[PDB]
Structure formats: structure tokens, C-alpha cells
């Protein structure tokens, strides 16, 4: 069984507590959340097609109490429809509570809650940057492998009313038609190069005229003329993405044709940045909601 109300309740019960109180669910409950949510991810299309109104968040990176502050201001599900753009674990202390509360809502409201895959929702990355460590200390190694099998079926991109294109990373030189995105057959591992790798790793750059090499050593960088031609060929108007920490929680690119979202404020304590989320009304009009520390 999955007493999900008891799970979501025991997670939200620490709301307002002193910072630093963990939520240790049972190994078989967390194991059940992965299987029941993986069941959902594979049933839904790999290229999600969503309808507004919808609230879009960026990266979380294990800042669970900061994920809760996002929900009180944005409305706890099912108040507003939600779509996340990956990067839920790592670089933060509470990665397990973060992904569990996100996996919990995805099961409770499977048509009003949505999660995309990020480059940190991959085995070879979260092993190093602190998520697998969080599994080792509080649970066992096999649970982290259960988490990997769940991430290996997350959707990659989401198209909101054929005018907003959402993904964690950015554009891909090998991306010519949406059928290439649907042609990807889950479960999948994120490769080191190619179409699937680029959608989770590429960055925008104002200095590149075309496709340039990325500093991360993975994927490429695209310029303002790449975004404009892409929106033009697929009758799109906006590219929403994350994958890059921004000072104001939001950062525009290519004359507002693209925007970078980062939802984790005070990211891992080495920046003083703020976290923002993008709200979308019925008329595809967008408003930014920002969390700023003082």
C-alpha cells in the first residue's frame, strides 16, 4: 500500500519548523513512490503537451525548506498547475525530502503536476554531487539505484500550447523536428553527447554567433540567432529553461525570446542570488514570482 496522505502529511508537517529538521520516511515508502511515479512517467508522453494556467519552476538542488517557501507563495497543489525543469537533488542538504515531496504530488495530482528531467537527474552526476551520499547515510545503496530507475523515465521537454518550449538545458544542433524527441524510447540513460544530452546541458551565450563549445566540457552553447530561427521553424514564441544560476531569479536572453529560471535562492550558500518562478495565465501571458532572501 501507499498511504500517500500520511506521506505528504509527514513531509509538510515540518513546515515552519526550525531550519534543519529532516523527514525520514520508510525505505519501503520511498521505494513505493519511485515505482508508482515511474508508472506515471512512462504512461505520459515523453514530450509532454500541457495547457495553461501553469507555474514553471527552475532548479531546486536539495533546498527543501526553499521548495516549501515556493509552494506557500505559489499555492500548494492542486491550487496551481506545476511543471518543473529538473535539478531537484545535489548541492543541497535535503535532497531526499525534496524529490519525495515532488514525487508525492506527481502521484496525487498526475494531471496537474509535472516534472522534467535535468542533468542532475542522472546516475553519473548525482553520484558525485551529494545525492547518492544522502542515500548512503540515511538509507542504503539499493535505494539510490531505485531512484536512478525512476529518473531514467522522466520526460525531457514539455510544450505548453505550442508556444512555450520547456527543458532543463537548452537547444540542440541535432534537433530538427519534435519527432526526434518523441522517438526517444524510455527507460534511457543520459548520454555524453547528442540530442538527448544537449537538451539537458546546453547554455545560451550572447557572444556566440551560432553553435560554440561549452565551458562545462559537455554539449554546446547557442547564440541569439539560433533561438530566433528555432522559434521561427516550429511556430514557437518562447524558450523557457533553467540549468544556470541567475542573480535576479530570472534572466532574459535574445530580446526576451528566452528566459533562464532558477528556483533555489541562496544557491548552496556560495551565491546571494534569489529564486523566481514563472506564472502563466490562460492567455499565455507570463508573470515572474520571486523569492528573495534578506
Amino acid at each position: 500500500k501507499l498511504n500517500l496522505d500520511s506521506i505528504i502529511g509527514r513531509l509538510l508537517e515540518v513546515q515552519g519548523s526550525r531550519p534543519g529538521k529532516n523527514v525520514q520516511l520508510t525505505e519501503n515508502e520511498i521505494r513505493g513512490l519511485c515505482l508508482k511515479s515511474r508508472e506515471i512517467f512512462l504512461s505520459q508522453p515523453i514530450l509532454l503537451e500541457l495547457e495553461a494556467p501553469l507555474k514553471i519552476c527552475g532548479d531546486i538542488h536539495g533546498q527543501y525548506y526553499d521548495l516549501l517557501r515556493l509552494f506557500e507563495y505559489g499555492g500548494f497543489p492542486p491550487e496551481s498547475n506545476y511543471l518543473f525543469l529538473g535539478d531537484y537533488v545535489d548541492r543541497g542538504k535535503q535532497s531526499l525530502e525534496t524529490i519525495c515531496l515532488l514525487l508525492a504530488y506527481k502521484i496525487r495530482y498526475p494531471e496537474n503536476f509535472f516534472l522534467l528531467r535535468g542533468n542532475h537527474e542522472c546516475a553519473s552526476i548525482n553520484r558525485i554531487y551529494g545525492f547518492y551520499d544522502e542515500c548512503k547515510r540515511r538509507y542504503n545503496i539499493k535505494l539510490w539505484k531505485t531512484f536512478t530507475d525512476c529518473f531514467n523515465c522522466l520526460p525531457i521537454a514539455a510544450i505548453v500550447d505550442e508556444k512555450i518550449f520547456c527543458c532543463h538545458g537548452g537547444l540542440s544542433p541535432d534537433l530538427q523536428s519534435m519527432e526526434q524527441i518523441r522517438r526517444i524510447m524510455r527507460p534511457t540513460d543520459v548520454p555524453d553527447q547528442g540530442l538527448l544530452c544537449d537538451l539537458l546541458w546546453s547554455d545560451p551565450d550572447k557572444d556566440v554567433q551560432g553553435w560554440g563549445e561549452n565551458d562545462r566540457g559537455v554539449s554546446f552553447t547557442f547564440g541569439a540567432e539560433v533561438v530566433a530561427k528555432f522559434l521561427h521553424k516550429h511556430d514557437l514564441d518562447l524558450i523557457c529553461r533553467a540549468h544556470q544560476v541567475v542573480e535576479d531569479g530570472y534572466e532574459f536572453f535574445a530580446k526576451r525570446q528566452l528566459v533562464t529560471l532558477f528556483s533555489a535562492p541562496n544557491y548552496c550558500g556560495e551565491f546571494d542570488n534569489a529564486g523566481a518562478m514563472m506564472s502563466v495565465d490562460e492567455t499565455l501571458m507570463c508573470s515572474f514570482q520571486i523569492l528573495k532572501p534578506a
Binding site: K163, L238, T283, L284, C286, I290
Partner: peptide, 21 residues
């Protein structure tokens, strides 16, 4: 079909600020 718009284009404030500690 509906096209994307922004709050600053229609006069609405684009940014809504919330603070914590």
C-alpha cells in the same frame, strides 16, 4: 490561436517580490 504576451507589455508589474530569512 493564442500567442505569448508579457505583463510589462500590458502595464502589469512583471515582478512580485517576497522576502524571508
Amino acid at each position: 490561436t493564442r500567442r505569448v504576451s508579457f505583463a510589462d507589455s500590458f502595464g502589469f508589474n512583471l515582478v512580485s517580490v517576497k522576502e524571508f530569512d
